[PDB]
Amino acid sequence: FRNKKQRKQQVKLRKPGFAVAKYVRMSPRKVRLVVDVIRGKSVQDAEDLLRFIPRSASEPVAKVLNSAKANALHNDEMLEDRLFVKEAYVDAGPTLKRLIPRARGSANIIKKRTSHITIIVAEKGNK
């Protein structure tokens, strides 16, 4: 224990099987669709389903998924063939407001959103 301040130093705080693509120029709502088929499974499948799934959000999710893997494995010395998407999700980063002209003088703002795709891989096992 000690007290907060000593803890901060006795510990460093880490993130097992975790990666995160911050600021992917896509709509969270759009990416979620893909991140959703991949939630909770054989990180192999995830690799596989992405290769085929038609949505263009797939690349980024791909990249984050193979980065979270290249961590669980390296910085975490994990056993890859027991790895599975423990958790994944999409949060919205800033928003690229941009102005668009409209009929008869009026104007409009197109919201070009963006997303933080983060995915957490973890060794499975039954027991």
Partner RNA sequence: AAAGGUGAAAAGAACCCCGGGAGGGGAGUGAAAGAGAACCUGAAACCGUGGACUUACAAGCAGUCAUGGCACCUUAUGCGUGUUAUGGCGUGCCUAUUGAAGCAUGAGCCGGCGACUUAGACCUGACGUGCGAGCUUAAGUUGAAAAACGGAGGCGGAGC
Partner RNA sequence: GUAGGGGAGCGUUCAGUCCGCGGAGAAGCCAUACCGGAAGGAGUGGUGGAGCCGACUGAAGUGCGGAUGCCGGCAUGAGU
Which residue type occupies 29? Answer: R
Structure tokens, 124: 């499975």
* Nearest CA among 88, 91, 90 for reference residue 40: 88
| Residue range at the interface with RNA (CB under 7 A); choices 41-49, 73-81, 98-106 | 73-81
Cα torsion angle, 116, 121, 126, 127, sign: negative
**H or E stretch including 111?**
strand 107-112
| Residue range at the interface with RNA (CB under 7 A); choices 41-49, 60-68, 99-107 | 60-68
Q: Considering only residues 87 through 126, tell me which ones interact with RNA, judged by CB under 7 A.
A: 87, 89-95, 97, 111, 113-114
Contact 112, 41 (CB under 8 A): no
For RNA (CB under 7 A), the number of binding residues is 48
User: Which positions lie near RNA, rule CB under 7 A?
Assistant: 3-5, 7-9, 11-15, 18-24, 27-30, 32, 36, 39, 60, 63-64, 66-67, 70-71, 73-76, 87, 89-95, 97, 111, 113-114
